[PDB]
């Protein structure tokens, strides 16, 4: 008993979100105001690194 | 001489592939070009003490001094998302626990040796920048900024 | 039938790109249905073993949960009117083995024929 | 009752004929695959003996 | 006769280049293809596999912004042309 | 079972080579350009 | 005719008749076409539908010997027929490394349309 | 005994169909052919369990009758019931023989 | 005189010759390797013994 | 383009390109059918190149044919298959006395000319709620597509149906 699932909860499956995605939710939720650099990164989102 | 085990499998590094560097610089340049156009933009150049080639100031804004008592992974650069708008970290391996939930873009510059051995730095770094020769960041950025 | 249940262990991996699988006649047909739904990037029969690729999105894989219903020691059968009760208000994928080949659970109810629940993909409780 | 009985009789005949054709065609297709494969094994086996 | 609507491209070339390329059947390879007018890009084969790894970030941007990102794969063309002086004769 | 016809890797490789009359496997190296 | 040629001294010509007779009874009356099978080798994985409609019941006919057939030989390992005994008596007589024996051995694989089996 | 709701499940219906044959016919293999014009056919049946949802098998050895005595030991045959009792053991009649064992 | 029918005659005939030569060479090399193996002293193992591979640690519990 | 002035220029290029391709394809098909039915030297050329692919030794250079003057207008004449002929053979198949098409070609393609079909640009659906969102969705029938029109489209793009037709023609040519 304890960590006896090789194929299960042992291997986390948490989605990886960048700054562009995280900031989009906070601004919409009304928790944080829109900064001046928010639009700068919107037109040129960062390249994915997990799949590389 | 060496009396240790000799490795057999040679791992390949695709993140720092010579062809991949073409798109890395092109994508990074677009982000910086749009940011500098706006007024009142400040950046942060975070390095390491061993980097003697890079001059550093005496005081550092946003630095918080804490004690050992009640310091369960305290965030040093917690208030560094007010005055600054872009941090260029040079040692992602050391500054990994503080930049986990940072609200600013991190332009980290690591090396293939550390990336393969410490893939955890990929989640904190947003824009990945290559580093030719991958030996010492102190003398690496100086050459780029003093080209021709 | 035993080799069919051995595919879930290989396909259910996070830090991997391609995994091998024993070659079987029934296993080949199953991969075709999954690819249509967009769950498998692709597969190739490498002789004695089949190489199947893994699909990922924002780090996490597309497959998060696999449930094996049918087992070699027994056989689960449901009538056309009983499958709807089991499968309701969900986005899961149930592999149904009918007389006219292999089809998903959505098509089984359309024809009204009695299928056989083999496995579950992206299924909760 | 006679009218209903005749109507039901026609349905049974139509269903029986439809099922007969479906089974005949399905069975014929399966036999072709087995026969084609069996032939290949027989000729191949004799080649190995030589 | 050329099929698959091949005459449209030949007639759209700079000058009467298609006529000479069809009657005589001159072979062309290298940068001359893009410089002649046939193609319009010089993307390397190594770019196609990379596109399959960073395709999840294309749906976040708008339609117009999608085409801008695809322009980072196109390279430049070298200075080389065999028919630089022979074009006037054709 | 040994007489079964299953598409393997070496089986297809030999078929392509047989077409070439007495055209073999080749590999390409990465393109390193300094002007990039 | 094959026996007379071998006794006289003709070795290359003798093997030609042996394959002719072995294939005659095996492949049916259709043997004049001295070449590989015209994409008619059925039973393979992912068979093309073009060749299926180019044949008829004629193709279904199996060869063999007078009494037994090809199928009987597959089940019983002791059964045989003269068409195979004569052909096998020549490979050992001239050896395995003999040029002519080597050429004839490979020819049977292609004539029967089964070369390249794994 | 099965409840009303237990007669509509696919598990029970499938088992029923396998057991059910025209004229209440059965399939079995002969295991004893010593007495004249007598053969003991071993039939295999099936049953369904509503607790664990699993089907098992249990053999049912019965006696049969043969006119021409064509059947032999270890030969699968077909039996048919009858609405009477003939002999001390005889309770079935042969129809045909599917498979025949060499000698 | 048919032009299309004659085309297939040459294609099939040429294809047969290519296979015959390819098969002959393949068989020659296949048997050559086996002959050498059956004419040499067997190789006696002299490496480390398998003392640690006896016991195993399978999945704990059920 | 990004500016309004630049964006407008792209429309002009797309308009002329769409018209030029239609004319080129229409005339390309006209010359393809007539050449195969009149030019007899094309048979030798096809066999010479086909046999030469395996080896240059099997490649032979045919004599082709002597040059002759031509009107260079008969190969680009319109062709139609229309039944009305009360006007003294108004159409009469391809040209007035040109090669004719088989009767069986009047099912899929009603006319030999190369036309343009109005292909849809959105996916179809079966649920009534989703059909209301499709642009091409008429309220007089409740469907987003014409069953009669789509029935013929599927038949045209079918390899299984084509194999049977091709096989039947081959047997007739070989036998007689």
UniProtKB/TrEMBL annotation, chain A:
<comment type="similarity">
    <text>Belongs to the mitochondrion-specific ribosomal protein mS23 family.</text>
</comment>
<protein>
    <recommendedName>
        <fullName>Small ribosomal subunit protein mS23</fullName>
    </recommendedName>
</protein>
UniProtKB/TrEMBL annotation, chain B:
<protein>
    <submittedName>
        <fullName>Uncharacterized protein</fullName>
    </submittedName>
</protein>
UniProtKB/TrEMBL annotation, chain E:
<protein>
    <submittedName>
        <fullName>Enoyl-CoA hydratase/isomerase family protein</fullName>
    </submittedName>
</protein>
TrEMBL record, chain J:
<protein>
    <submittedName>
        <fullName>Enoyl-CoA hydratase/isomerase family protein</fullName>
    </submittedName>
</protein>
């Amino acid at each position: 008993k304890g960590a006896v699932h090789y194929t299960g909860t042992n291997f986390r499956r948490v989605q990886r979100l960048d700054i562009v995605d995280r900031m989009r939710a906070l601004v919409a939720q009304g928790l944080v105001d829109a900064p001046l650099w928010l639009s700068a990164a919107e037109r040129a989102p960062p390249m994915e690194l997990s799949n590389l | 001489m060496n009396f240790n085990r000799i490795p057999t499998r040679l791992s390949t590094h695709y993140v720092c592939d010579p062809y991949t560097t073409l798109m890395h610089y092109r994508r990074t340049f677009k982000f910086l070009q749009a940011l500098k156009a706006k007024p009142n933009c400040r950046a942060l150049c975070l390095g390491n003490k061993n980097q003697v080639n890079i001059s550093w100031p005496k005081h550092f804004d946003g630095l918080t001094v804490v004690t050992s008592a009640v310091a369960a992974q305290s965030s040093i650069l917690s208030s560094a998302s007010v005055y600054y708008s872009l941090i260029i970290c040079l040692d992602p391996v050391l500054f990994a626990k503080h930049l986990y939930r940072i609200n600013v873009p991190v332009l980290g510059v690591c090396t293939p040796r550390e990336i393969h051995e410490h893939p955890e730095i990929l989640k904190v770094i947003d824009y990945l920048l290559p580093a030719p020769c991958s030996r010492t960041d102190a003398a690496l950025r100086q050459l780029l900024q003093r080209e021709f | 039938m035993q080799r069919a249940c051995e595919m879930v262990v290989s396909l259910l991996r996070v830090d991997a790109l391609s995994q091998r699988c024993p070659f079987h006649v029934l296993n080949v047909q199953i991969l075709d249905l999954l690819q249509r739904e967009g769950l498998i990037r692709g597969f190739k029969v490498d002789g004695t073993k089949i190489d199947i690729l893994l699909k990922h999105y924002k780090g996490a894989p597309v497959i998060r949960n696999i449930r094996v219903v049918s087992k070699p020691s027994r056989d689960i059968w449901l009538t056309p009117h009983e499958l709807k009760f089991r499968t309701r208000f969900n986005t899961g994928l149930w592999i149904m083995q009918t007389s006219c080949g292999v089809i998903s659970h959505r098509d089984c109810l359309r024809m009204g024929i009695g299928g056989k629940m083999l496995m579950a993909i992206n299924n909760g409780y | 009752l006679a009218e209903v009985t005749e109507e039901e009789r026609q349905k049974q005949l139509q269903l029986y004929l439809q099922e007969k054709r479906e089974r005949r065609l399905r069975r014929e297709e399966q036999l072709q695959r087995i026969y084609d494969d069996k032939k290949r094994r027989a000729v191949l086996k004799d080649r190995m003996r030589i | 006769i050329p099929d698959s609507g091949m005459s449209f491209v030949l007639a759209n070339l700079r000058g009467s280049l298609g006529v000479f390329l069809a009657l005589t059947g001159h072979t062309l390879s290298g940068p001359d293809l893009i410089w002649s007018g046939l193609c319009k890009h010089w993307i390397s084969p190594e770019a196609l596999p990379f596109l399959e790894l960073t395709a999840e970030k294309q749906l976040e941007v708008s339609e117009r912004e999608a085409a801008v990102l695809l322009e980072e794969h196109f390279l430049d063309a070298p200075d080389a042309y065999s028919l630089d002086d022979w074009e006037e004769v054709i | 079972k040994h007489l079964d016809h299953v598409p393997t890797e070496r089986a297809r490789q030999l078929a392509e080579q047989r077409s070439a009359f007495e055209p073999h496997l080749r590999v390409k190296l990465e393109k390193e350009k300094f002007l990039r | 005719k094959a026996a007379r040629l071998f006794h006289g001294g003709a070795y290359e010509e003798a093997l030609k008749f042996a394959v002719f007779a072995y294939r005659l009874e095996c492949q049916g009356p259709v043997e004049t076409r001295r070449a590989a099978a015209p994409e008619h080798v059925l039973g393979k994985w992912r068979d093309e539908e073009a060749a299926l409609l180019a044949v008829d019941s004629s193709h279904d006919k199996v060869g063999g010997n007078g009494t037994e057939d090809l199928f009987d030989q597959m089940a019983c390992a002791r059964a045989g027929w003269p068409a195979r005994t004569l052909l096998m008596a020549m490979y050992m007589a001239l050896g395995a490394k003999h040029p002519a024996v080597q050429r004839s051995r490979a020819e049977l694989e292609v004539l029967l349309g089964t070369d390249g089996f794994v | 005994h099965y409840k009303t709701w237990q007669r509509n499940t696919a598990g029970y219906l499938r088992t029923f169909m396998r057991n059910k044959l025209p004229n209440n016919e059965m399939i079995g293999y002969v295991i004893n052919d010593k007495h004249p014009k007598s053969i003991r056919v071993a039939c295999d049946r099936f049953m369904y369990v509503m607790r664990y949802k699993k089907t098992f098998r249990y053999t049912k050895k019965v006696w049969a009758h043969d006119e021409e005595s064509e059947a032999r030991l270890g030969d699968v045959v077909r039996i048919q019931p009858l609405g009477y009792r003939i002999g001390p053991w005889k309770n079935y009649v042969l129809v045909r023989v599917l498979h025949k064992e060499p000698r | 005189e048919s032009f299309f029918l004659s085309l297939c005659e040459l294609e099939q005939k040429k294809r047969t010759e290519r296979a015959i030569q390819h098969s002959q060479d393949l068989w020659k090399k296949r048997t050559a390797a086996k002959d050498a193996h059956s004419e040499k002293t067997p190789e006696l193992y002299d490496g480390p013994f398998w003392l640690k591979f006896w016991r195993r640690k399978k999945r704990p519990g059920a | 383009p990004f500016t309004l002035q630049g964006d407008c220029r792209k429309q002009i290029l797309e308009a002329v390109e769409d018209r030029l391709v239609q004319e080129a394809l229409q005339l390309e098909l006209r010359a393809a059918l007539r050449l195969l039915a009149w030019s007899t030297d094309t048979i030798d050329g096809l066999r010479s190149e086909c046999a030469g692919r395996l080896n240059p030794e099997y490649a032979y250079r045919p004599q082709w044919k002597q040059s002759q003057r031509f009107h260079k207008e008969s190969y680009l004449t319109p062709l139609q298959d229309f039944f009305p002929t009360i006007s003294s053979s108004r159409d009469a198949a391809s040209h007035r006395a040109g090669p004719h098409i088989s009767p069986s070609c009047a099912y899929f393609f009603p006319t030999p000319e190369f036309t343009v079909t109005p292909r849809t640009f959105f996916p179809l659906s079966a649920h009534p709620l989703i059909r209301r969102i499709h642009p091409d969705f008429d309220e007089e029938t409740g469907n987003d597509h014409n069953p009669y029109a789509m029935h013929k489209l599927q038949m045209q793009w079918n390899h299984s149906l084509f194999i049977q037709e091709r096989m039947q023609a081959l047997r007739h040519f070989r036998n007689v």
